[PDB]
Protein backbone atom coordinates (compact mmCIF):
# COMPACT_ATOMS: atom_id res chain seq x y z
CA UNK A 1 0.00 0.00 0.00
CA UNK A 2 1.16 3.40 -1.11
CA UNK A 3 1.11 6.20 1.48
CA UNK A 4 1.37 9.97 0.96
CA UNK A 5 1.48 11.99 4.17
CA UNK A 6 2.02 15.73 3.79
CA UNK A 7 2.93 17.37 7.08
CA UNK A 8 4.22 15.69 10.25
CA UNK A 9 5.73 17.54 13.22
CA UNK A 10 6.70 15.02 15.89
CA UNK A 11 9.41 15.02 18.52
CA UNK A 12 9.66 11.21 18.37
CA UNK A 13 8.81 8.53 15.83
CA UNK A 14 9.55 4.84 15.44
CA UNK A 15 8.81 3.02 12.16
CA UNK A 16 9.05 -0.70 11.40
CA UNK A 17 7.72 -2.19 8.15
CA UNK A 18 7.28 -5.85 7.24
CA UNK A 19 5.59 -6.14 3.86
CA UNK A 20 5.88 -4.07 0.65
CA UNK A 21 4.76 -0.51 1.43
CA UNK A 22 5.46 2.57 -0.67
CA UNK A 23 5.40 5.38 1.86
CA UNK A 24 6.50 8.98 1.65
CA UNK A 25 6.18 11.45 4.53
CA UNK A 26 6.76 15.19 4.73
CA UNK A 27 7.46 17.47 7.67
CA UNK A 28 9.86 17.57 10.64
CA UNK A 29 10.72 14.28 12.35
CA UNK A 30 13.07 13.43 15.22
CA UNK A 31 13.46 9.81 14.14
CA UNK A 32 15.39 7.34 16.31
CA UNK A 33 15.48 3.83 14.81
CA UNK A 34 14.74 2.01 11.50
CA UNK A 35 14.56 -1.65 10.61
CA UNK A 36 13.64 -2.90 7.12
CA UNK A 37 13.07 -6.46 5.98
CA UNK A 38 10.96 -6.26 2.82
CA UNK A 39 10.55 -4.53 -0.55
CA UNK A 40 9.62 -1.33 1.26
CA UNK A 41 10.34 2.14 -0.07
CA UNK A 42 10.41 5.27 2.06
CA UNK A 43 11.30 8.94 1.68
CA UNK A 44 11.35 11.81 4.19
CA UNK A 45 11.99 15.46 3.35
CA UNK A 46 13.35 17.01 6.54
CA UNK A 47 14.60 15.30 9.68
CA UNK A 48 16.43 17.09 12.49
CA UNK A 49 17.48 14.13 14.61
CA UNK A 50 20.27 13.21 16.99
CA UNK A 51 21.06 9.50 16.56
CA UNK A 52 20.05 7.13 13.75
CA UNK A 53 20.41 3.36 13.64
CA UNK A 54 19.49 1.73 10.32
CA UNK A 55 19.30 -2.02 9.73
CA UNK A 56 18.30 -3.08 6.21
CA UNK A 57 17.94 -6.71 5.26
CA UNK A 58 16.43 -7.89 1.97
CA UNK A 59 15.81 -5.18 -0.68
CA UNK A 60 14.78 -1.83 0.76
CA UNK A 61 14.92 1.72 -0.56
CA UNK A 62 15.39 4.62 1.85
CA UNK A 63 15.59 8.30 0.89
CA UNK A 64 16.31 10.82 3.64
CA UNK A 65 17.51 14.41 3.85
CA UNK A 66 18.31 16.67 6.77
CA UNK A 67 20.59 17.05 9.77
CA UNK A 68 21.87 14.15 11.87
CA UNK A 69 24.43 14.24 14.66
CA UNK A 70 25.31 10.54 14.63
CA UNK A 71 24.60 7.89 12.00
CA UNK A 72 24.95 4.10 12.12
CA UNK A 73 24.12 2.15 8.95
CA UNK A 74 23.98 -1.62 8.32
CA UNK A 75 23.16 -3.01 4.89
CA UNK A 76 22.98 -6.78 4.45
CA UNK A 77 22.22 -7.71 0.85
CA UNK A 78 20.57 -6.07 -2.18
CA UNK A 79 19.82 -2.98 -0.08
CA UNK A 80 20.18 0.63 -1.18
CA UNK A 81 20.61 3.62 1.12
CA UNK A 82 20.18 6.98 -0.65
CA UNK A 83 21.63 9.06 2.12
CA UNK A 84 22.76 11.84 -0.19
CA UNK A 85 21.42 15.25 1.02
CA UNK A 86 21.54 13.85 4.58
CA UNK A 87 24.42 15.78 6.12
CA UNK A 88 25.82 13.84 9.08
CA UNK A 89 28.51 14.74 11.58
CA UNK A 90 29.62 11.24 12.58
CA UNK A 91 29.09 8.28 10.29
CA UNK A 92 29.67 4.57 10.92
CA UNK A 93 28.73 2.53 7.84
CA UNK A 94 29.04 -1.21 7.27
CA UNK A 95 28.02 -2.89 4.02
CA UNK A 96 27.74 -6.55 3.10
CA UNK A 97 27.29 -8.26 -0.22
CA UNK A 98 25.81 -6.32 -3.17
CA UNK A 99 24.57 -3.30 -1.22
CA UNK A 100 24.84 0.39 -2.15
CA UNK A 101 25.35 3.43 0.11
CA UNK A 102 25.43 7.21 -0.48
CA UNK A 103 27.14 9.10 2.32
CA UNK A 104 27.47 12.80 3.09
CA UNK A 105 29.70 13.04 6.15
CA UNK A 106 30.92 16.45 7.30
CA UNK A 107 33.29 15.98 10.22
CA UNK A 108 34.03 12.29 10.71
CA UNK A 109 33.57 9.32 8.39
CA UNK A 110 34.20 5.64 9.19
CA UNK A 111 33.34 2.95 6.68
CA UNK A 112 33.81 -0.72 5.86
CA UNK A 113 32.85 -2.56 2.68
CA UNK A 114 33.21 -6.30 2.76
CA UNK A 115 32.52 -8.23 -0.50
CA UNK A 116 31.21 -6.79 -3.79
CA UNK A 117 29.43 -3.93 -2.02
CA UNK A 118 29.75 -0.22 -2.73
CA UNK A 119 30.01 2.93 -0.65
CA UNK A 120 29.99 6.29 -2.40
CA UNK A 121 30.54 9.50 -0.50
CA UNK A 122 29.72 12.94 -1.76
CA UNK A 123 31.44 15.33 0.65
CA UNK A 124 35.00 15.67 1.86
CA UNK A 125 34.89 15.25 5.62
CA UNK A 126 37.60 16.46 7.94
CA UNK A 127 38.65 12.95 8.92
CA UNK A 128 38.16 9.86 6.73
CA UNK A 129 38.85 6.19 7.41
CA UNK A 130 37.78 3.39 5.07
CA UNK A 131 38.46 -0.34 4.91
CA UNK A 132 38.00 -2.93 2.21
CA UNK A 133 37.69 -6.67 2.71
CA UNK A 134 37.12 -8.89 -0.35
CA UNK A 135 35.75 -7.06 -3.40
CA UNK A 136 34.00 -4.07 -1.89
CA UNK A 137 34.80 -0.55 -2.88
CA UNK A 138 34.50 3.05 -1.69
CA UNK A 139 34.68 5.64 -4.44
CA UNK A 140 34.82 9.41 -4.57
CA UNK A 141 32.14 10.04 -7.24
CA UNK A 142 32.17 13.81 -7.01
CA UNK A 143 31.87 16.31 -9.81
CA UNK A 144 35.42 17.36 -11.00
CA UNK A 145 33.99 20.45 -12.62
CA UNK A 146 32.80 22.77 -9.87
CA UNK A 147 34.66 26.05 -9.71
CA UNK A 148 35.39 25.83 -5.97
CA UNK A 149 36.28 22.22 -5.19
CA UNK A 150 38.65 21.76 -2.26
CA UNK A 151 41.54 19.27 -2.23
CA UNK A 152 42.87 16.93 0.45
CA UNK A 153 45.05 18.04 3.35
CA UNK A 154 47.75 16.31 5.35
CA UNK A 155 44.93 15.06 7.57
CA UNK A 156 42.39 13.71 5.07
CA UNK A 157 44.71 11.86 2.78
CA UNK A 158 44.03 8.12 2.91
CA UNK A 159 44.83 5.74 0.11
CA UNK A 160 42.15 3.14 -0.81
Among the listed residues 32, 35, 45, 78, the single contact to other proteins using CB under 8 A = 45
**Separation CA 89–CA 48 (nearest Å):** 12
Q: Does 20 bind other proteins (CB under 8 A)?
A: no
CB nearer to other proteins: pick between 19 and 145: 145
Q: In the stretch 89-128, what mask flags binding to other proteins with x, by CB under 8 A?
A: ---x-x-------------x-x-x-x-x----------x-
Where on the phi/psi map is residue 12: left (φ > 0), alpha (ψ -120 to 50), or beta? beta
User: Which contacts of 118-125 are long-range, i.e. CB under 8 A and separated by 24 or more positions?
Assistant: 119/93, 119/95, 122/84, 123/87, 124/150, 124/152, 124/156, 125/91, 125/156
**Residues in contact with other proteins by the rule CB under 8 A:** 45-46, 65-67, 72, 85-87, 92, 94, 108, 110, 112, 114, 116, 127, 129, 131-137, 139-141, 143-149, 151-152, 154-155, 157-160
Amino acid sequence: GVTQINGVSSRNLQIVLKGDPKVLISGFVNLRQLDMYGKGTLSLYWIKSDTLTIRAKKAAKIQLAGIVNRLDVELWDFAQFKGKYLRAQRSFVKTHDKSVAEISAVNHQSSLATDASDIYYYNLSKTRADFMAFNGSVLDMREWGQSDLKDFDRYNKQFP
